[PDB]
UniProtKB/Swiss-Prot annotation, chain A:
Note: The protein was initially thought to contain two functionally distinct parts: The core channel (from the N-terminus to the S9 segment) that mediates the channel activity, and the cytoplasmic tail (from the S9 segment to the C-terminus) that mediates the calcium sensing. The situation is however more complex, since the core channel also contains binding sites for Ca(2+) and Mg(2+).
Protein name, UniProt field: Calcium-activated potassium channel subunit alpha-1
Binding site for Mg(2+): 19, 42, 44
Lineage, uppermost ranks: Eukaryota, Metazoa, Chordata, Craniata, Vertebrata
Topology Cytoplasmic: residue spans: 1-614
This protein's encoding gene: KCNMA1
Region of interest: Segment S7: 136-156
Annotated phenotype, changing residue 260 to S: Loss of heme-induced channel inhibition
Chain span(s) of sequence motif Calcium bowl: 438-460
Organism for this UniProt entry: Homo sapiens
Curated annotation (Swiss-Prot), chain C:
Associated disease: Paroxysmal non-kinesigenic dyskinesia 3 with or without generalized epilepsy: An autosomal dominant neurologic disorder characterized by absence seizures, generalized tonic-clonic seizures, paroxysmal nonkinesigenic dyskinesia and involuntary dystonic or choreiform movements. Onset is usually in childhood. Patients may have seizures only, dyskinesia only, or both. Epilepsy, idiopathic generalized 16: An autosomal dominant form of idiopathic generalized epilepsy, a disorder characterized by recurring generalized seizures in the absence of detectable brain lesions and/or metabolic abnormalities. Generalized seizures arise diffusely and simultaneously from both hemispheres of the brain. Seizure types include juvenile myoclonic seizures, absence seizures, and generalized tonic-clonic seizures. EIG16 is characterized by onset of seizures soon after birth or in the first years of life.
Description of its domains: The S0 segment is essential for the modulation by the accessory beta subunits KCNMB1, KCNMB2, KCNMB3 and KCNMB4. The S4 segment, which is characterized by a series of positively charged amino acids at every third position, is part of the voltage-sensor.
Annotated organism of origin: Homo sapiens (Human)
Note: The protein was initially thought to contain two functionally distinct parts: The core channel (from the N-terminus to the S9 segment) that mediates the channel activity, and the cytoplasmic tail (from the S9 segment to the C-terminus) that mediates the calcium sensing. The situation is however more complex, since the core channel also contains binding sites for Ca(2+) and Mg(2+).
Its biological purpose: Potassium channel activated by both membrane depolarization or increase in cytosolic Ca(2+) that mediates export of K(+). It is also activated by the concentration of cytosolic Mg(2+). Its activation dampens the excitatory events that elevate the cytosolic Ca(2+) concentration and/or depolarize the cell membrane. It therefore contributes to repolarization of the membrane potential.
Domain of life: Eukaryota
Name this polypeptide is given: Calcium-activated potassium channel subunit alpha-1
Disulphide bridges: none
Extracellular side: 20-33, 57-65
Gene of this entry: KCNMA1
Residues that hold Mg(2+) according to the record: 137, 160, 162
Extent of motif Selectivity for potassium: 50-53
Stretches assigned to the RCK N-terminal domain: 105-237
Length: 615, 355, 237
């Protein structure tokens, strides 16, 4: 409730005349009562059960704008909680079938039950937010390009802007946090033009970053296309997704007309006056392999030492034979997307208890390169056997989602694991340069992961160095997403199609039917379905933009990349000690989301980009 | 509301006059001011009436009935050129909405303060209107005895009488002599006792549950303090205090401040009371930086972390203590820490903290 | 608390005395009432106890106004200080204290698993109407407070049965029940336990404690398992 109210009732949020009514059959404690009293002018509480129609009539559910169902993330059995939430959805839709429902789902396979309810209309705004799927997809996309989770979390969360006058990194960083995500209908002047041309026009003239469009067809349903190539042409009445600082400026994309706005360059002056072997799965959007037993992937410490792993992913898991499953497939599916070549796939090594991993291997044995090292993440010997100093990313996850006497203590394992890896020493020289992502139950613990920081203890979550650098993932940001889903239902769809790797509803239905990923022979239709866009990072040290990265402007890089390689640059991952004159050994980098046209570049920068697929 | 206050002041001034007297409307402008106030109230009543969804329930509203008993008397008074005291004291009931006014003026924000102001306003309003009833009845006299039972009581003497009665003191220096006055005093005693009995739970809620181990440590100059946290129970604290505060120990000006998020039981409370001159306790968590600021950890000489020797999983306790060390060193890296560790292999984690 | 109460009483009495003897200032001080200071102290005490004799009272306007405010403030302060009054009253101990040794009256100390059924059976056989007159009192020692049924059973035999809260393993509690002069110690066992061996070890340790305090006392104990009683031969006493 604290997280949801913090994001929903933000001071910088535009004036909305919406009240919040909580319905729950457990009486609140002292802290909840104090929190309700703090927001007594906008928040009401009532004691009752959703499954009782009398209580539904009490809170006037027949006239509510929406119903939001929160889930118990800390339960012994996730499936029981999912079934309870689905039954609550059934009860609410039985009372009033036309109400909009946004629910939280723990496990990914349980959301198919929501398609069994006849009143559940996804096209009318009913949504399910899968915590495990979204969280592990965020982590996987950050494995492909670090800091993307921070960018996305800042992109759909309300953040108060603070003016910084001193020359620090928080200034450049706080510039981007202002950005938000909007949807708008493209003007009639943009029809018949390719996507890169419209994107360049929006960036240069209207100062809007257009990320994706919603393509409609007669054969299939509407599908979100992320940075389509120049072969595609804009149709009539196509929705587009923009990243912009102000909501009012988005309307320029709808009121644009070449007759009396092409001559003027200033966006402020724009007005409304118009004038034989199975290599991929059945749908062909994921890499597939023949099923193999768990005995063929288990490596001993000596066996893992004999092989050499470089540029791989190390997933450390604090599992248990009785702990709740976390659904590791949602982490491996984005990393095995068909838009990656086979040689570009990153080896995944799971370090953890084999008793826990045997329960998860049933959904993981169809993926090409997955290895298991039975042991513990807290042992330096196992981490040295797996070549932790040469990995592309280390992901520390805690399966023990059970309730603890102190809420903060739930993060006691992972933090120590992080502090172990940063303290190791290697010779051909230290573990501080190893890229690590750590999930965190409590936000207040985010500053425990970093020591080379001057943050005062009352610093908010989004301003800490671990969050700004993308080295820490806080699950509480998902609690904000629901609020962002209420004011705009396309945000969740765009996030899912950008993060999960392109899970089409047909694949959803197939997985619901069989609870497995089925292989299939390659056909030209599937190979055409393979062509998508992927998230990547580029360095300006020796690329084609090396000369432009030496003091050039960001807009020139954006225009050149989009015109030449159909590449969509949407952020700078910048070395933290880059504005200082004195040299530094720090390799930490922070995230700058959508810099302006006149933003200056330095050669020690990384560029977030959307690569096209080529053969 | 301001005009209601003004009309109440007008009634207070007019109560010092004979209860029924002839007067000229044009000779005194106080009656003109009262007439203007009453016609404004009538206009507001009509404005409420023309925009009421339910006629019956609006007709029984307390504002409607208090306006029903005020303006027809002043109409009859201006028509007859003679004024009777009437039921003007009922205007005091308009003070009940006072809290709402303050809210519109954004003077009150918290819910508890609003409820307190509402309770005070309702108490004052019912006190004043009961005093007005008693004053009118006592000065008027009994009607069936040709008004020969009049008692010369001022309004404020009746306020004093109501206050003395409702506190169950009853001096007897002033009391109601008429039959109607005594009947109304009996009914007022019954109603006041019933209302107090009904409002007792709100009084208890406003008193609330006082915090016992809140607040912050006060830094005495020239007096070092040691912050003790971890597993705080009877046995560990007893042993540590027995060795630390020894009679044969040389005079050391060191205070001990315990920080723990479980409230102490009777034995710990007695032990703390025995050493109340040197030992303080506070309720909080080490992992919360606000609680660390409460006990002045930035000026403590040392932090001592005790361990739960009697636990199902020693490794979990060791990890919790290491995380407490991490939190303390994150708040203030220069503080000295002495911790208890259960298992030997877990202390290597302490070398992973650069502080 | 006593000092603050006395100080506010005295200062309120003095203020009332000043106001009453001075008289109303706007009436040329013609309302003076000849009240001594101690009469005003008496008036304040009679008022604040809500007695109100009316023999002495404030006649001036300021006196009555300040008496009204004093009544309000006194009631408010009393309501605020009620929790401290309750805390100072505190929770009175019910089964504390020490047994009093009556001369010429032997006593038996009973400990172990003390519940309704075992105590009921033991008292039913021990305190029999047909039993010959024996001047023996029974003192139970147990660190769990009795429930309603046990309290009723103890009240039924209040002339011969005493109960005390304590532990046998604590020598102070042993000194409380005068174990050094008891005729015998009887240890009852929990016949319904998950682990009989743990109960037997606990009873043997109780025997060790009692024989450590006073080696010459007679002990009759209940043992669950047969092999556990050999431990009783390891005690030298
Ligand atoms: C704006 C908001 C709303 C509420 C509020 O402010 C915030 O409104 C304010 C405003 O509205 C105020 C009122 C305005 C009108 C005031 C009138 C005033 O009475 C006047 O007092 C004068 C005093 O010199 C005269 O009285 C005469 O005084 C002579 C001696 O000097 C006597 O002799 C003679 O008798 C008196 O005459 C009096 O009046 C008649 C003469 O015309 C008769 O002789 C009558 O007998 C006698 O008594 C005069 O004649 C009389 O009128 C009264 O004392 C207070 C009064 C009512 C005020 C009380 C407080 C208010 C309500 C204020 C209130 C806070
Ligand atoms: C909410 C605040 C506090 C209360 C108050 O202000 C508003 O109310 C005002 C108002 O009520 C005033 C009274 C109005 C009536 C006045 C009457 C006047 O005349 C005398 O009145 C006596 C009776 O009271 C005699 O009879 C005789 O008629 C005459 O000798 C007297 O001299 C002062 C008087 C009593 C006033 C004293 C001062 C007040 C109480 C004012 C007082 C500050
Ligand atoms: C005219 C005279 C005036 C004086 C007097 O007589 C008339 O007034 C009477 C009246 O005012 C009485 C009071 C009325 C209100 C009473 C309230 C009562 O507390 C009740 O106790 C319940 C016990 O179950 C509730 O407790 C809840 O219980 C839940 C579990 O069931 C928990 O949650 C949590 O505990 C609580 O929630 C809750 O705590 C509360 O409902 C308290 O125990 C006694 C009480 C204060 C009374 C004490 C005696 C009085 C003062 C009487 C007094 C003689
Ligand atoms: C001018 C007149 C005088 C007389 C009077 O009116 C005004 O004074 C009023 C005022 O003085 C009242 C008292 C105020 C103080 C009150 C205290 C209240 O006890 C509260 O009860 C709570 C219940 O949860 C707390 O209990 C804690 O609860 C924890 C768990 O939540 C546990 O720990 C443990 O139990 C406690 O710790 C704690 O026990 C205490 O906070 C009690 O139940 C009634 C109480 C005594 C009241 C009784 C009625 C009164 C006397 C009123 C009375 C009519
Ligand atoms: C210095 C002080 C001066 C006092 C002077 C005498 C004034 C009293 C004389 C008169 C007032 C009588 C009516 C009281 C109000 C009834 C309606 C109401 O709000 O009820 C409230 C309580 O009240 C009850 O619970 C009902 C009490 C009815 C008493 C009737 C007695 C008749 C003889 C509701 O309480 P709640 O918390 O909403 O529940
Ligand atoms: C025989 C006896 C003679 C008595 C004569 C009349 C004396 C009374 C006259 C006057 C004293 C009035 C002020 C009381 C003290 C306020 C400050 C204070 O210490 O508050 C205390 C209580 O007090 C409160 O909680 C506030 C009570 C305010 C009452 C105001 C009434 C005004 C009319 C704080 O209490 P705590 O436990 O720290 O919490
Ligand atoms: C112990 C110290 C307390 C008190 C010491 C004694 C002080 C008063 C005695 C001397 C004054 C006296 O009697 O003179 C005259 C005044 O008479 C009174 O004052 C009588 C009323 C006394 C009230 C009770 C005393 C204070 C209560 C307890 C206060 C505790 C604090 C005689 O009056 P008369 O002849 O009747 O006319
Ligand atoms: C603060 C505003 C309160 C009050 C402001 C003051 C109003 C009264 C003062 C003027 C009236 C006055 O004294 O005239 C005569 C009447 O005498 C009395 O009325 C004396 C009794 C007053 C009781 C206490 C006042 C109300 C209590 C508290 C009410 C709180 C609400 C003089 O009488 P005499 O000469 O003795 O014959
Ligand atoms: C809810 C309330 C307003 C209704 C109660 C009725 C009240 C206001 C009525 C009913 C009986 C009335 C009394 C009846 C007789 C007389 C005698 C005369 O000298 C006028 C006043 C006086 C003393 C009246 C005062 C007002 C009175 C008390
Ligand atoms: C916190 C306290 C000290 C402040 C309260 C003010 C008190 C002390 C003042 C304010 C008004 C004063 C009164 C005003 C007028 C007179 C008349 C004269 O014969 C002197 C005494 C007497 C009766 C005063 C006594 C003291 C008094 C009541
Ligand atoms: K934002
Ligand atoms: K009395
Ligand atoms: K009396
Ligand atoms: K009384
Ligand atoms: K009395």
């Amino acid at each position: 409730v604290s997280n949801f109210l913090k994001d929903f009732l933000h001071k910088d949020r535009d004036d909305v005349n919406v009240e919040i009514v909580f319905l729950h059959n457990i009486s609140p404690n002292l802290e909840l009562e104090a929190l309700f009293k703090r927001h007594f002018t906008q928040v009401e509480f009532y004691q009752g059960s959703v499954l009782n129609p009398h209580d539904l009539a009490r809170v006037k559910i027949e006239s509510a704008d929406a119903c939001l169902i929160l889930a118990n993330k800390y339960c012994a059995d996730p499936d029981a909680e999912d079934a309870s939430n689905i039954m609550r959805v059934i009860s609410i839709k039985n009372y009033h079938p036309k109400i909009r429902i946004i629910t939280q789902m723990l496990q990914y396979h349980n959301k198919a039950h929501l398609l069994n309810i006849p009143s559940w209309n996804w096209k009318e705004g009913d949504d399910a937010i899968c915590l495990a799927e979204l969280k592990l997809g965020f982590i996987a996309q950050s494995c492909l390009a670090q800091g993307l989770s921070t960018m996305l979390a800042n992109l759909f969360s309300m953040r108060s802007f603070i003016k910084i006058e001193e020359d620090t990194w928080q200034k450049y960083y706080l510039e981007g946090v202002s950005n938000e995500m909007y949807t708008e209908y493209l003007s009639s002047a943009f029809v018949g033009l390719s996507f890169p041309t419209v994107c360049e026009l929006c960036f240069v003239k209207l100062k809007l970053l257009m990320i994706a469009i919603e393509y409609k067809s007669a054969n299939r349903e509407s599908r979100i296309l992320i940075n389509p190539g120049n072969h595609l042409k804009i149709q009539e009445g196509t929705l587009g997704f923009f990243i912009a600082s102000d909501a009012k400026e988005v309307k320029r994309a709808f009121f644009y007309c070449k007759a009396c706005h092409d001559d003027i360059t200033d966006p402020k002056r724009i007005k409304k006056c118009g004038c034989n072997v199975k290599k991929y799965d059945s749908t062909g959007m994921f890499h597939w392999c023949a099923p193999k037993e768990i005995e063929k992937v288990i490596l001993t410490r000596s066996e893992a030492a004999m092989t050499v792993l470089s540029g791989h992913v190390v997933v450390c898991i604090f599992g248990d034979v009785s702990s709740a499953l976390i659904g590791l497939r949602n982490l491996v599916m984005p990393l095995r997307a068909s838009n990656f070549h086979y040689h570009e796939l990153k080896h995944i090594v799971f370090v953890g208890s084999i008793e826990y991993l045997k329960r998860e291997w049933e959904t993981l044995h169809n993926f090409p390169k997955v290895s298991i090292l039975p042991g513990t993440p807290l042992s330096r010997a196992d981490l040295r056997a797996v070549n932790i100093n040469l990995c592309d990313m280390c992901v520390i996850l805690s399966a023990n989602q059970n309730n603890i006497d102190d809420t903060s203590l739930q993060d006691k394992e992972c933090i120590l694991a992080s502090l172990n890896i940063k303290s190791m020493q290697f010779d051909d020289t230290t573990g501080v340069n190893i890229p690590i992502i750590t999930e965190l139950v409590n936000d207040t613990n985010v500053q425990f992961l970093d020591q080379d920081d001057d943050d005062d203890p009352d610093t908010e979550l989004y301003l800490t160095q671990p969050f700004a650098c993308g080295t820490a993932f806080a699950v509480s940001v998902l609690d904000s997403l629901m609020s962002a889903t209420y004011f705009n239902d396309n945000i969740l769809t765009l996030i899912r199609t950008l993060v999960t790797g392109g899970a089409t509803p047909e694949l959803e239905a197939l997985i619901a039917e069989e609870n497995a990923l089925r292989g299939g022979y390659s056909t030209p239709q599937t190979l055409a379905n393979r062509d998508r866009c992927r998230v990547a990072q580029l360095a300006l040290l020796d690329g084609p933009f090396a000369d432009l990265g030496d003091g050039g402007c960001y807009g020139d890089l954006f225009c050149k990349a989009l015109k030449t390689y159909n590449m969509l640059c949407f952020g700078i991952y910048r070395l933290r000690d880059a504005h200082l004159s004195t040299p530094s050994q720090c390799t930490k980098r922070y995230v700058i989301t959508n810099p302006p046209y006149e933003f200056e570049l330095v050669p020690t920068d990384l560029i977030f980009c959307l690569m096209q697929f080529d053969s | 509301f301001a005009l209601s206050i003004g009309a109440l002041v007008i009634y207070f001034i007019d109560s010092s006059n004979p209860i029924e007297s002839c007067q000229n409307f044009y000779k005194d402008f106080t009656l003109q001011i009262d007439m203007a106030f009453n016609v404004f109230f009538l206009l507001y009543f009509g404005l409420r009436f023309i925009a009421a969804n339910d006629k019956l329930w609006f007709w029984l509203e307390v504002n409607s009935v208090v306006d029903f008993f005020t303006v027809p008397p002043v109409f009859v008074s201006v028509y007859l050129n003679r004024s009777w005291l009437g039921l003007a004291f009922l205007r005091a009931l308009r003070l009940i909405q006072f809290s709402e006014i303050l809210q519109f003026l954004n003077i009150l924000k918290t819910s508890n303060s609003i409820k307190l102001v509402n309770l005070l306003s309702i108490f004052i309003s019912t006190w004043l209107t009961a005093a007005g009833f008693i004053h009118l009845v006592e000065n008027s006299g009994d009607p069936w005895e040709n008004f020969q039972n009049n008692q010369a009581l001022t309004y404020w003497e009746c306020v004093y009488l109501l206050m003395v009665t409702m506190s169950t003191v009853g001096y007897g220096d002033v009391y109601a002599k008429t039959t109607l006055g005594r009947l109304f005093m009996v009914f007022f005693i019954l109603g006041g006792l019933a209302m107090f009995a009904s409002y007792v739970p709100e009084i208890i809620e406003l008193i609330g549950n006082r915090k016992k181990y809140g607040g912050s440590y006060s830094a005495v100059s020239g007096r070092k303090h040691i912050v003790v946290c971890g597993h705080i129970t009877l046995e560990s604290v007893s042993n540590f205090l027995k060795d630390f505060l020894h009679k044969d120990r040389d005079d050391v000006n060191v205070e001990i401040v315990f920080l723990h998020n479980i409230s102490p039981n009777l034995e710990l409370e007695a032990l703390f009371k025995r050493h109340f001159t040197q030992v303080e306790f506070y309720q909080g968590s080490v992992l919360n930086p606000h609680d660390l600021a409460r006990v002045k950890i930035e000026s403590a000489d040392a932090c001592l972390i005790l361990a739960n020797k009697y636990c199902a999983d020693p490794d979990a306790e060791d990890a919790s203590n290491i995380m407490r060390v991490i939190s303390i060193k994150n708040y203030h890296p220069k503080i000295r820490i002495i911790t208890q560790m259960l298992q030997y292999h877990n202390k290597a984690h302490l070398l992973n903290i650069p502080s």
